Coordinates of C-alpha atoms in Angstrom, one line a residue:
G1 CA 1.1 -50.9 -22.4
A2 CA -1.2 -51.9 -19.6
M3 CA -0.9 -54.1 -16.5
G4 CA -3.2 -56.8 -15.2
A5 CA -2.3 -57.2 -11.5
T6 CA -2.7 -61.0 -11.8
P7 CA -3.8 -63.6 -14.3
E8 CA -7.1 -63.9 -12.4
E9 CA -7.5 -60.1 -12.4
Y10 CA -6.6 -60.0 -16.1
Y11 CA -9.3 -62.6 -16.7
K12 CA -11.8 -60.6 -14.6
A13 CA -11.1 -57.5 -16.7
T14 CA -10.8 -59.0 -20.2
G15 CA -12.6 -62.4 -20.3
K16 CA -9.4 -64.1 -21.4
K17 CA -7.6 -66.7 -19.4
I18 CA -3.9 -67.3 -19.4
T19 CA -4.0 -71.2 -19.5
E20 CA -0.4 -72.0 -20.2
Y21 CA 3.1 -70.6 -19.6
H22 CA 5.9 -70.3 -22.2
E23 CA 9.6 -69.5 -22.1
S24 CA 12.5 -68.5 -24.4
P25 CA 14.0 -71.4 -26.3
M26 CA 17.4 -70.8 -24.7
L27 CA 15.7 -71.5 -21.3
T28 CA 13.9 -74.6 -22.6
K29 CA 17.3 -76.0 -23.7
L30 CA 18.6 -75.5 -20.1
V31 CA 15.7 -77.3 -18.4
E32 CA 16.0 -80.1 -20.9
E33 CA 19.7 -80.4 -20.0
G34 CA 18.6 -80.4 -16.3
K35 CA 20.2 -77.1 -15.4
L36 CA 17.0 -75.1 -14.7
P37 CA 13.6 -75.9 -13.2
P38 CA 10.7 -75.6 -15.7
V39 CA 9.0 -72.2 -16.2
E40 CA 5.9 -73.3 -14.2
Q41 CA 8.2 -73.7 -11.2
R42 CA 10.4 -70.6 -11.9
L43 CA 7.4 -68.2 -12.2
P44 CA 5.5 -67.1 -9.1
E45 CA 2.0 -68.3 -8.4
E46 CA 0.6 -65.0 -9.6
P47 CA 3.0 -63.3 -12.1
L48 CA 2.5 -59.7 -13.3
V49 CA 0.6 -59.7 -16.5
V50 CA 1.8 -57.2 -19.2
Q51 CA -0.2 -56.0 -22.2
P52 CA 2.1 -55.3 -25.1
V53 CA 2.5 -51.7 -26.4
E54 CA 1.9 -53.0 -30.0
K55 CA 1.5 -56.8 -30.2
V56 CA 2.4 -60.1 -28.6
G57 CA 6.1 -60.5 -29.0
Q58 CA 8.5 -63.3 -30.0
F59 CA 11.4 -64.7 -28.0
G60 CA 15.0 -64.2 -28.9
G61 CA 17.7 -61.8 -30.1
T62 CA 20.5 -59.5 -28.9
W63 CA 19.5 -55.9 -28.4
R64 CA 22.5 -53.8 -29.5
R65 CA 23.1 -50.5 -27.8
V66 CA 26.1 -48.3 -27.0
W67 CA 27.3 -46.7 -23.8
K68 CA 30.2 -44.6 -22.3
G69 CA 31.4 -47.3 -19.9
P70 CA 30.9 -47.6 -16.1
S71 CA 30.4 -43.8 -16.0
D72 CA 27.1 -44.4 -17.9
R73 CA 25.7 -46.5 -15.0
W74 CA 22.2 -45.0 -14.9
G75 CA 21.4 -45.7 -18.5
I76 CA 21.6 -49.4 -17.7
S77 CA 19.7 -48.9 -14.4
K78 CA 16.8 -47.3 -16.3
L79 CA 16.6 -50.4 -18.6
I80 CA 16.7 -52.8 -15.7
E81 CA 14.8 -51.2 -12.9
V82 CA 11.8 -52.8 -11.2
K83 CA 9.3 -51.3 -8.8
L84 CA 6.7 -52.5 -6.3
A85 CA 4.4 -50.5 -8.5
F86 CA 5.4 -48.8 -11.7
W87 CA 4.3 -45.4 -13.1
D88 CA 1.8 -45.8 -15.9
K89 CA 3.1 -44.4 -19.2
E90 CA 2.1 -40.8 -18.5
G91 CA 3.3 -40.6 -14.9
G92 CA 0.3 -39.8 -12.6
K93 CA -0.9 -43.1 -11.3
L94 CA 0.5 -46.3 -9.9
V95 CA 0.3 -49.6 -11.7
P96 CA 1.0 -53.1 -10.4
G97 CA 4.7 -54.3 -10.3
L98 CA 6.2 -56.7 -7.8
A99 CA 3.3 -55.8 -5.6
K100 CA 0.0 -57.1 -7.0
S101 CA -2.0 -54.7 -4.8
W102 CA -1.4 -52.1 -2.1
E103 CA -3.4 -50.4 0.6
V104 CA -3.3 -46.8 2.0
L105 CA -4.5 -46.7 5.7
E106 CA -4.7 -44.4 8.7
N107 CA -5.0 -41.4 6.3
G108 CA -1.6 -42.0 4.5
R109 CA 0.2 -42.9 7.7
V110 CA 0.6 -46.6 6.9
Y111 CA 1.0 -48.4 3.5
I112 CA 0.6 -52.1 3.0
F113 CA 2.1 -53.8 -0.1
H114 CA 0.9 -57.3 -1.1
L115 CA 3.6 -59.3 -2.7
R116 CA 3.4 -62.2 -5.1
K117 CA 4.0 -65.6 -3.5
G118 CA 6.7 -67.7 -5.2
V119 CA 8.7 -64.9 -6.7
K120 CA 12.4 -66.0 -6.8
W121 CA 15.6 -64.0 -7.2
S122 CA 17.7 -64.6 -10.4
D123 CA 19.7 -67.3 -8.5
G124 CA 16.5 -69.2 -7.5
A125 CA 16.3 -68.1 -3.9
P126 CA 12.9 -66.9 -2.6
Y127 CA 12.0 -63.2 -2.6
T128 CA 10.0 -62.1 0.5
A129 CA 9.1 -59.0 2.3
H130 CA 12.1 -59.6 4.6
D131 CA 14.3 -58.5 1.6
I132 CA 12.5 -55.2 1.7
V133 CA 12.9 -54.8 5.4
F134 CA 16.5 -55.8 5.1
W135 CA 16.9 -53.1 2.6
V136 CA 15.2 -50.2 4.4
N137 CA 16.6 -51.0 7.9
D138 CA 20.1 -52.4 7.2
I139 CA 21.1 -50.6 4.0
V140 CA 19.1 -47.3 3.8
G141 CA 18.9 -47.1 7.6
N142 CA 22.5 -48.0 8.1
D143 CA 24.7 -44.9 8.8
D144 CA 28.0 -46.5 7.5
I145 CA 26.5 -47.8 4.2
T146 CA 24.2 -44.8 3.7
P147 CA 25.5 -41.7 5.5
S148 CA 23.0 -39.4 3.8
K149 CA 19.4 -40.5 4.2
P150 CA 16.6 -40.1 1.7
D151 CA 13.6 -37.7 2.0
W152 CA 11.1 -40.5 2.9
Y153 CA 13.4 -42.1 5.5
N154 CA 14.0 -38.8 7.3
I155 CA 10.2 -38.7 7.9
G156 CA 10.1 -41.3 10.7
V157 CA 9.3 -44.8 9.2
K158 CA 8.8 -48.3 10.6
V159 CA 8.9 -51.2 8.2
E160 CA 8.0 -54.8 9.0
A161 CA 7.1 -58.0 7.2
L162 CA 3.5 -58.8 8.5
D163 CA 4.2 -62.1 6.7
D164 CA 6.5 -63.4 3.9
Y165 CA 4.4 -61.6 1.3
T166 CA 3.1 -58.5 3.1
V167 CA 5.2 -55.5 4.0
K168 CA 4.0 -52.5 6.0
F169 CA 5.4 -49.0 5.9
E170 CA 4.3 -47.0 9.0
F171 CA 5.2 -43.4 9.0
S172 CA 5.1 -40.9 11.9
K173 CA 2.1 -38.8 10.8
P174 CA 0.4 -38.8 7.4
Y175 CA 2.5 -38.8 4.2
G176 CA 0.5 -39.0 1.0
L177 CA 3.6 -38.1 -1.2
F178 CA 5.0 -41.6 -0.5
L179 CA 3.0 -43.1 -3.3
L180 CA 4.9 -40.9 -5.7
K181 CA 8.2 -42.2 -4.3
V182 CA 7.5 -45.9 -5.0
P183 CA 7.6 -45.8 -8.8
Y184 CA 10.8 -43.8 -8.7
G185 CA 12.8 -45.6 -6.0
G186 CA 14.2 -49.0 -5.1
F187 CA 11.5 -50.2 -2.7
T188 CA 11.8 -53.8 -4.0
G189 CA 14.7 -54.2 -1.6
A190 CA 17.9 -56.3 -1.9
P191 CA 18.9 -60.0 -1.5
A192 CA 19.5 -60.5 2.2
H193 CA 20.4 -64.2 1.6
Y194 CA 23.4 -63.0 -0.5
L195 CA 24.3 -59.8 1.2
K196 CA 24.1 -60.6 4.9
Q197 CA 27.6 -62.3 4.7
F198 CA 29.0 -58.8 4.1
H199 CA 27.1 -57.1 6.9
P200 CA 28.5 -56.8 10.4
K201 CA 25.1 -56.9 12.1
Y202 CA 24.5 -60.5 10.7
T203 CA 28.1 -61.7 10.3
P204 CA 31.1 -61.7 12.6
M205 CA 33.4 -58.8 11.6
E206 CA 36.4 -61.3 11.5
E207 CA 34.6 -63.3 8.8
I208 CA 33.9 -60.2 6.8
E209 CA 37.5 -59.1 7.0
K210 CA 38.6 -62.4 5.5
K211 CA 36.6 -61.6 2.3
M212 CA 38.0 -58.1 1.9
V213 CA 40.8 -57.8 -0.6
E214 CA 43.7 -55.4 0.0
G215 CA 44.3 -52.5 -2.2
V216 CA 40.6 -52.4 -3.1
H217 CA 38.4 -52.7 0.0
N218 CA 39.7 -50.4 2.8
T219 CA 36.6 -50.7 4.9
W220 CA 33.7 -53.2 5.1
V221 CA 31.4 -50.6 3.6
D222 CA 33.6 -50.8 0.4
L223 CA 33.1 -54.6 0.2
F224 CA 29.4 -54.3 0.8
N225 CA 28.8 -51.6 -1.9
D226 CA 31.0 -53.6 -4.4
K227 CA 28.9 -56.7 -3.7
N228 CA 25.6 -54.7 -3.8
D229 CA 26.7 -53.1 -7.1
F230 CA 24.1 -54.0 -9.8
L231 CA 26.4 -53.0 -12.6
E232 CA 29.8 -54.4 -11.4
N233 CA 28.8 -57.6 -9.5
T234 CA 27.9 -60.5 -11.8
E235 CA 27.1 -62.5 -8.7
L236 CA 24.5 -60.2 -7.3
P237 CA 21.0 -61.9 -7.3
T238 CA 18.4 -59.6 -9.0
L239 CA 14.7 -59.1 -9.7
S240 CA 15.5 -57.3 -13.0
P241 CA 14.5 -58.7 -16.4
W242 CA 18.2 -58.9 -17.3
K243 CA 21.4 -59.4 -15.3
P244 CA 25.1 -58.6 -16.1
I245 CA 27.2 -61.5 -17.3
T246 CA 30.4 -59.5 -18.2
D247 CA 32.5 -56.7 -16.7
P248 CA 31.5 -53.2 -17.7
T249 CA 35.2 -52.3 -18.5
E250 CA 35.2 -54.9 -21.3
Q251 CA 34.1 -53.4 -24.6
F252 CA 30.9 -55.4 -24.7
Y253 CA 28.9 -55.1 -21.4
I254 CA 26.3 -57.9 -21.7
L255 CA 23.1 -58.5 -19.8
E256 CA 21.4 -61.9 -20.0
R257 CA 17.8 -62.7 -19.3
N258 CA 16.8 -63.4 -15.7
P259 CA 15.4 -66.9 -15.9
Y260 CA 13.3 -66.3 -12.8
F261 CA 11.7 -63.1 -14.0
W262 CA 8.2 -62.8 -12.6
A263 CA 6.1 -61.1 -15.3
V264 CA 4.4 -62.6 -18.3
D265 CA 2.5 -61.6 -21.5
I266 CA -1.2 -61.7 -22.0
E267 CA -0.4 -65.0 -23.8
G268 CA 1.7 -66.3 -20.8
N269 CA 5.1 -65.8 -22.3
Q270 CA 7.7 -65.2 -19.5
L271 CA 9.3 -61.9 -20.1
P272 CA 11.6 -60.4 -21.3
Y273 CA 11.2 -61.3 -24.9
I274 CA 14.8 -60.4 -25.6
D275 CA 17.5 -62.9 -24.6
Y276 CA 20.5 -60.5 -24.4
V277 CA 21.2 -56.8 -24.4
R278 CA 24.7 -55.7 -25.3
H279 CA 26.3 -52.3 -24.8
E280 CA 29.4 -51.5 -26.8
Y281 CA 31.8 -49.1 -25.1
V282 CA 32.2 -45.9 -27.2
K283 CA 34.6 -43.0 -26.9
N284 CA 32.3 -40.0 -27.7
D285 CA 28.9 -38.7 -29.0
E286 CA 30.2 -38.9 -32.5
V287 CA 30.8 -42.7 -32.5
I288 CA 27.2 -42.9 -31.2
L289 CA 25.7 -40.9 -34.0
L290 CA 27.5 -42.8 -36.7
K291 CA 26.4 -46.2 -35.4
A292 CA 22.8 -44.9 -35.0
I293 CA 22.8 -43.6 -38.5
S294 CA 24.3 -46.8 -39.9
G295 CA 21.6 -48.9 -38.3
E296 CA 24.0 -50.5 -35.8
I297 CA 21.8 -49.6 -32.8
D298 CA 18.6 -51.7 -32.4
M299 CA 16.9 -49.2 -30.1
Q300 CA 18.2 -46.4 -28.0
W301 CA 17.2 -43.0 -26.6
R302 CA 19.8 -42.2 -24.0
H303 CA 22.4 -40.3 -25.9
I304 CA 20.4 -40.1 -29.1
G305 CA 17.8 -37.8 -27.4
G306 CA 20.2 -35.1 -26.3
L307 CA 21.9 -34.9 -29.7
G308 CA 18.4 -34.8 -31.4
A309 CA 17.8 -31.4 -29.7
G310 CA 20.4 -30.0 -32.1
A311 CA 19.1 -29.4 -35.6
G312 CA 22.2 -30.9 -37.3
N313 CA 21.7 -34.3 -35.6
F314 CA 17.9 -34.6 -35.9
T315 CA 18.0 -33.9 -39.7
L316 CA 20.8 -36.5 -40.1
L317 CA 18.8 -39.1 -38.1
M318 CA 15.8 -38.5 -40.2
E319 CA 17.7 -38.4 -43.5
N320 CA 19.3 -41.8 -42.6
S321 CA 16.3 -43.7 -41.3
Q322 CA 15.5 -45.2 -44.7
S323 CA 19.1 -46.3 -45.4
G324 CA 19.7 -47.2 -41.8
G325 CA 16.6 -49.5 -41.6
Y326 CA 15.1 -47.7 -38.6
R327 CA 12.5 -45.1 -37.5
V328 CA 12.8 -42.0 -35.5
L329 CA 10.5 -41.8 -32.5
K330 CA 9.2 -38.3 -31.8
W331 CA 9.5 -38.4 -28.0
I332 CA 9.5 -35.1 -26.2
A333 CA 11.3 -33.7 -23.2
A334 CA 9.2 -32.8 -20.2
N335 CA 9.8 -29.0 -20.2
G336 CA 6.9 -26.6 -20.2
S337 CA 9.2 -24.1 -21.8
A338 CA 12.8 -24.1 -23.1
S339 CA 13.1 -20.4 -22.0
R340 CA 10.6 -18.6 -19.7
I341 CA 10.8 -15.3 -17.7
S342 CA 9.5 -14.0 -14.5
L343 CA 9.5 -10.4 -13.5
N344 CA 10.7 -9.2 -10.0
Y345 CA 7.4 -9.0 -8.2
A346 CA 9.2 -7.9 -5.0
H347 CA 11.2 -5.2 -7.0
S348 CA 12.9 -2.6 -4.8
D349 CA 11.8 0.2 -7.1
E350 CA 8.2 0.7 -6.0
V351 CA 7.1 2.1 -9.4
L352 CA 8.2 -0.9 -11.4
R353 CA 6.9 -3.3 -8.7
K354 CA 3.4 -1.8 -9.3
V355 CA 3.6 -2.2 -13.1
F356 CA 5.0 -5.7 -12.7
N357 CA 2.3 -7.0 -10.3
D358 CA -0.4 -5.8 -12.7
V359 CA -1.6 -9.0 -14.3
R360 CA -2.5 -7.0 -17.4
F361 CA 1.1 -6.0 -17.9
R362 CA 2.1 -9.7 -18.0
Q363 CA -0.9 -10.7 -20.2
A364 CA 0.4 -7.9 -22.5
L365 CA 4.0 -9.0 -22.3
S366 CA 3.1 -12.6 -23.5
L367 CA 0.7 -11.5 -26.3
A368 CA 3.5 -9.5 -27.8
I369 CA 5.6 -12.6 -28.2
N370 CA 5.7 -14.3 -31.6
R371 CA 6.4 -17.9 -30.4
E372 CA 5.9 -19.4 -33.8
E373 CA 8.7 -17.2 -35.1
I374 CA 11.1 -18.1 -32.3
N375 CA 10.3 -21.7 -33.1
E376 CA 11.3 -21.3 -36.8
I377 CA 14.7 -19.6 -36.5
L378 CA 16.3 -20.7 -33.2
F379 CA 14.7 -24.1 -32.9
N380 CA 14.7 -25.1 -36.6
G381 CA 11.7 -25.0 -36.0
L382 CA 11.0 -27.7 -33.4
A383 CA 9.1 -28.1 -31.3
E384 CA 6.0 -26.4 -29.9
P385 CA 4.9 -22.7 -29.4
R386 CA 3.2 -22.6 -26.0
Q387 CA 3.3 -20.8 -22.6
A388 CA 4.4 -22.0 -20.2
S389 CA 3.2 -24.9 -18.2
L390 CA 2.7 -28.6 -17.7
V391 CA 3.5 -30.4 -21.0
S392 CA 1.0 -32.5 -23.1
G393 CA 0.9 -36.1 -22.0
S394 CA 1.1 -35.6 -18.2
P395 CA -1.3 -36.4 -15.4
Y396 CA -2.3 -32.9 -14.4
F397 CA -1.9 -31.3 -17.9
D398 CA -3.7 -28.0 -18.3
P399 CA -5.0 -27.2 -21.9
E400 CA -6.4 -23.8 -20.9
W401 CA -3.1 -22.8 -19.2
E402 CA -1.1 -24.1 -22.1
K403 CA -2.8 -21.4 -24.2
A404 CA -3.0 -18.7 -21.5
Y405 CA -2.2 -15.6 -23.5
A406 CA -0.1 -17.6 -25.9
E407 CA -1.3 -15.9 -29.1
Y408 CA 0.9 -13.5 -31.1
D409 CA -1.5 -10.5 -30.8
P410 CA 0.5 -7.2 -30.6
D411 CA -2.5 -4.9 -31.2
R412 CA -4.2 -6.6 -28.3
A413 CA -1.2 -6.1 -26.0
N414 CA -0.5 -2.5 -27.0
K415 CA -4.2 -2.0 -26.1
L416 CA -3.8 -3.7 -22.7
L417 CA -0.9 -1.3 -21.8
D418 CA -3.1 1.7 -22.8
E419 CA -5.7 0.3 -20.4
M420 CA -3.1 0.6 -17.6
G421 CA -2.2 4.2 -18.3
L422 CA 1.3 3.6 -19.6
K423 CA 1.3 6.6 -22.0
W424 CA 3.5 6.6 -25.2
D425 CA 6.3 9.1 -25.2
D426 CA 6.4 12.1 -27.6
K427 CA 8.3 10.2 -30.3
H428 CA 5.9 7.2 -29.9
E429 CA 9.0 5.0 -29.5
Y430 CA 8.6 3.6 -26.0
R431 CA 6.0 4.4 -23.3
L432 CA 6.5 5.8 -19.8
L433 CA 6.0 5.0 -16.2
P434 CA 3.8 7.1 -13.9
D435 CA 6.9 9.2 -12.9
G436 CA 7.8 10.0 -16.5
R437 CA 10.7 7.5 -16.7
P438 CA 11.1 5.6 -19.9
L439 CA 9.4 2.2 -19.5
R440 CA 12.6 0.1 -19.4
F441 CA 14.1 -2.8 -17.6
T442 CA 16.9 -5.4 -18.0
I443 CA 16.4 -9.0 -18.7
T444 CA 18.9 -11.1 -16.9
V445 CA 20.0 -14.4 -18.4
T446 CA 22.8 -16.9 -18.2
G447 CA 23.9 -18.7 -21.4
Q448 CA 24.3 -17.7 -25.0
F449 CA 21.2 -19.7 -25.9
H450 CA 18.9 -17.6 -23.7
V451 CA 20.5 -14.4 -25.0
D452 CA 19.4 -15.3 -28.5
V453 CA 15.8 -16.1 -27.4
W454 CA 15.2 -12.9 -25.6
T455 CA 17.3 -10.7 -28.0
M456 CA 14.5 -11.5 -30.4
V457 CA 11.9 -10.6 -27.8
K458 CA 13.6 -7.2 -27.6
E459 CA 12.1 -6.5 -31.0
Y460 CA 8.6 -7.9 -30.2
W461 CA 8.3 -5.9 -27.0
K462 CA 9.6 -2.7 -28.7
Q463 CA 6.4 -2.9 -30.9
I464 CA 4.4 -2.4 -27.6
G465 CA 6.8 0.3 -26.4
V466 CA 8.5 -1.8 -23.7
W467 CA 12.2 -1.2 -23.7
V468 CA 14.5 -4.0 -22.7
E469 CA 18.2 -4.9 -22.7
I470 CA 19.8 -8.2 -22.2
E471 CA 22.6 -8.9 -19.7
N472 CA 24.3 -12.3 -19.9
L473 CA 25.8 -13.1 -16.5
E474 CA 28.2 -15.9 -15.5
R475 CA 26.3 -18.8 -13.7
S476 CA 27.3 -18.0 -10.1
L477 CA 26.8 -14.2 -10.4
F478 CA 23.4 -14.8 -12.0
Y479 CA 22.5 -16.8 -8.8
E480 CA 24.0 -14.3 -6.4
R481 CA 22.0 -11.5 -8.1
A482 CA 18.9 -13.7 -7.8
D483 CA 19.2 -14.4 -4.1
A484 CA 19.8 -10.7 -3.4
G485 CA 16.7 -9.5 -5.3
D486 CA 19.0 -7.5 -7.6
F487 CA 17.2 -7.9 -10.9
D488 CA 14.2 -6.7 -12.9
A489 CA 13.6 -10.0 -14.7
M490 CA 15.1 -13.5 -14.7
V491 CA 14.9 -16.1 -17.5
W492 CA 15.2 -19.9 -16.9
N493 CA 13.9 -23.0 -18.5
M494 CA 11.0 -24.9 -17.1
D495 CA 11.9 -28.6 -17.0
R496 CA 10.2 -31.3 -14.9
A497 CA 6.8 -30.2 -16.1
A498 CA 5.2 -33.7 -16.4
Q499 CA 5.3 -34.9 -12.8
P500 CA 5.9 -31.7 -10.8
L501 CA 5.2 -33.2 -7.3
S502 CA 8.7 -34.8 -7.1
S503 CA 10.1 -31.3 -7.7
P504 CA 7.3 -29.0 -6.8
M505 CA 9.1 -25.7 -6.3
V506 CA 8.1 -24.2 -9.6
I507 CA 4.4 -24.7 -9.2
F508 CA 4.2 -24.4 -5.4
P509 CA 5.8 -21.6 -3.4
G510 CA 7.6 -23.0 -0.3
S511 CA 7.2 -26.6 -1.3
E512 CA 11.1 -27.0 -1.2
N513 CA 14.0 -25.4 0.7
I514 CA 14.9 -23.4 -2.4
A515 CA 12.6 -21.1 -4.3
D516 CA 12.0 -20.6 -8.0
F517 CA 12.9 -17.2 -9.4
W518 CA 9.2 -16.1 -9.8
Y519 CA 8.5 -16.0 -6.1
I520 CA 12.0 -15.7 -4.7
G521 CA 11.5 -12.2 -3.3
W522 CA 8.4 -13.4 -1.4
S523 CA 10.4 -16.2 0.3
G524 CA 10.4 -14.2 3.6
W525 CA 6.6 -14.0 3.8
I526 CA 6.0 -17.5 2.3
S527 CA 8.2 -19.0 5.1
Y528 CA 6.4 -16.8 7.7
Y529 CA 3.0 -18.0 6.3
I530 CA 3.8 -21.7 6.4
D531 CA 5.3 -21.4 9.8
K532 CA 2.3 -19.5 11.2
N533 CA -0.7 -21.3 9.6
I534 CA 0.4 -24.8 8.5
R535 CA 2.7 -25.8 11.4
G536 CA 1.2 -24.0 13.1
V537 CA 3.8 -23.1 15.7
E538 CA 4.7 -19.5 14.6
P539 CA 7.7 -17.2 14.7
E540 CA 7.6 -14.1 17.0
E541 CA 9.4 -12.0 14.3
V542 CA 7.7 -10.6 11.2
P543 CA 9.7 -10.1 8.0
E544 CA 9.8 -6.8 6.0
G545 CA 9.5 -6.4 2.2
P546 CA 6.4 -6.6 -0.1
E547 CA 3.9 -9.2 0.9
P548 CA 2.7 -11.5 -1.9
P549 CA -0.8 -11.5 -3.5
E550 CA -3.3 -13.7 -1.6
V551 CA -3.5 -16.1 -4.6
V552 CA 0.1 -17.0 -3.8
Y553 CA -0.7 -17.9 -0.2
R554 CA -3.4 -20.1 -1.8
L555 CA -0.9 -22.1 -3.9
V556 CA 0.9 -23.0 -0.6
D557 CA -2.4 -24.3 0.9
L558 CA -3.0 -26.4 -2.2
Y559 CA 0.5 -28.0 -1.9
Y560 CA 0.2 -28.9 1.7
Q561 CA -3.2 -30.5 1.0
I562 CA -1.6 -32.5 -1.9
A563 CA 1.2 -33.5 0.5
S564 CA -1.3 -35.0 3.0
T565 CA -3.9 -36.7 0.7
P566 CA -3.1 -40.1 -0.9
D567 CA -5.9 -40.9 -3.4
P568 CA -4.9 -39.6 -6.9
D569 CA -8.5 -38.4 -7.7
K570 CA -8.1 -35.6 -5.1
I571 CA -4.6 -34.9 -6.3
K572 CA -5.7 -34.4 -9.9
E573 CA -8.5 -32.1 -8.6
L574 CA -6.1 -30.1 -6.4
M575 CA -3.5 -29.8 -9.2
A576 CA -6.4 -28.4 -11.4
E577 CA -6.8 -25.5 -8.9
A578 CA -3.1 -24.8 -8.9
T579 CA -2.9 -24.7 -12.6
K580 CA -6.0 -22.5 -12.6
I581 CA -4.3 -20.0 -10.3
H582 CA -1.1 -20.0 -12.6
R583 CA -3.5 -19.5 -15.5
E584 CA -5.3 -16.4 -14.1
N585 CA -1.9 -14.9 -12.9
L586 CA 1.0 -15.2 -15.4
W587 CA 4.0 -15.1 -13.1
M588 CA 6.0 -17.2 -15.6
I589 CA 5.9 -16.1 -19.3
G590 CA 7.5 -18.8 -21.4
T591 CA 8.0 -19.3 -25.1
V592 CA 7.3 -22.6 -26.8
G593 CA 7.9 -25.8 -24.9
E594 CA 8.3 -29.6 -25.4
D595 CA 11.7 -30.0 -27.1
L596 CA 12.0 -33.0 -29.2
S597 CA 13.9 -35.8 -27.4
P598 CA 14.0 -38.4 -30.1
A599 CA 14.8 -42.1 -30.0
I600 CA 15.4 -44.6 -32.7
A601 CA 14.3 -48.2 -33.1
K602 CA 15.1 -50.6 -36.0
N603 CA 12.1 -51.5 -38.1
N604 CA 12.2 -55.0 -36.7
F605 CA 12.4 -53.8 -33.1
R606 CA 8.9 -53.7 -31.7
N607 CA 6.6 -52.8 -28.8
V608 CA 8.3 -49.4 -28.6
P609 CA 5.7 -46.5 -28.1
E610 CA 5.4 -44.0 -30.9
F611 CA 4.9 -41.1 -28.5
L612 CA 6.4 -40.6 -25.0
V613 CA 7.3 -37.9 -22.6
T614 CA 10.9 -38.2 -21.2
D615 CA 12.1 -37.2 -17.7
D616 CA 14.4 -38.6 -15.0
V617 CA 11.4 -38.9 -12.6
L618 CA 9.7 -41.3 -15.0
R619 CA 13.0 -43.3 -15.3
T620 CA 12.9 -43.0 -19.1
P621 CA 13.1 -45.3 -21.0
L622 CA 11.5 -47.5 -18.2
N623 CA 8.5 -45.4 -18.9
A624 CA 8.3 -47.2 -22.3
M625 CA 8.4 -50.6 -20.4
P626 CA 11.4 -52.3 -22.1
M627 CA 10.8 -55.7 -20.6
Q628 CA 8.2 -56.2 -23.4
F629 CA 10.2 -54.8 -26.3
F630 CA 11.0 -57.5 -28.8
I631 CA 12.9 -58.2 -32.0
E632 CA 11.0 -59.8 -34.9
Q633 CA 12.0 -63.4 -35.6

């Protein structure tokens, strides 16, 4: 729902005081038996304050799910994860987490995070900024434990605890993108008080070897990673709302509430609401669907939401909601299109290149597409005729660009080609290029699904006299053709269209070390440009081939601005320009978008959002904030 950084801050915003703290009965029993300190002591001085999605919840219950065993690690992680600052629900802005407030200084060179005094790990030990430092220096920054470094660490970084409750990240140079890393990654750190006994920097190697077990831990790194394993190690102190109390190989993998969890309700209830969450090991997708349909799953999206793409599974989930005692949540995937196309704008054939770089040709090509129709037959009819951009419910969403030339207007396209001078042939069957060649090209795809999509577009484009055929190539040949520039047109999906900036290659040329298909031929010049202007220490050698439009060089400039600026006001304004550019030029021509990625929740399972966009970058379902889910009592 929403986050008050602090009870005081919640009060300042809302006029309501949290005057009293409450706890789950099972925890009250423990403190009465003398085995736990009381909630007032367990909580920090200033807990995170969480506003329910739906209503103030009730304590108790066991949340039944299903998983595919230890292999299915990240499904548990995405229930259990905690951040210094979380994504909001949509995915554009930071929201208080384990940090009550943060600070961006020296133009995105340094970041200060202010922690919450009195936060304790799940075993009772104090959580401090030293646990973060321990994590960045001695785990992430340790070559044995972590041989391959993360993006943000390869940019030079110095991390220090200014005091117990203040941590400072100082980068070499500015680095505005870091704010987008924090809601994704594990910057909350790790429990040094527990882990240092397994670390050679802090413990004599002889003492470490005495705790290794033969036939399992061959090196000390193996022991460390086993101990720092959130899934396997029941003894690992945690900041998560639940902790494992059974082995994941057992048929029931059980998480129990963390009695030191550091967030509360608007009414002062210490979260989570739910006491236990249990996953049953299951053998296959089909056991998952039968248990879902039978109302044996209290709430789940993970495997439900890939099956719900297929028409046979979605119908069945819907048909069974009533008997099953659950509802189907119409969450969407974060793809701007399930199947888009880009033409080869560096085409070797100079005649086709010219036709292809004419905006009007692309405008025409999209207008000839009956998206609504494609929806009905292939998608059944799910989900949304559009082209072909950032999906609805995303920070930088573009409503204009969603509509582009999205209409099914053949007469308008046909006309737009006539404007170009592409004259119809004598049999008025297809039209012709300036050299009298039949206007024809091949659409290159990989996968039977995409064949079907564009096989239908074969017809729609025939109505404007544009001749196409469809070649379906094996994955690796498809990619080798692409890197060689040996194609007329390439189709691909367009996922990661909610928060592009974690995977910016599709919107921004030269934002990553690999290019998207639509500008791949321009990679020579794009690399030459960035090297010259932005660095700006240039290369002495100029590359051959067609140079890109000036509007492409602009998209680069936008990205490198976005990369350097921290305040998300400026980002949203800068992304506006990018999406404007992509609007005026239609380098990607998609059909539809926003596949349904459904979840289910029992009728008595509450505080689950009706609508949601799902993506790995948003850590779905963390995006729904499961710490405040509850079961009616």
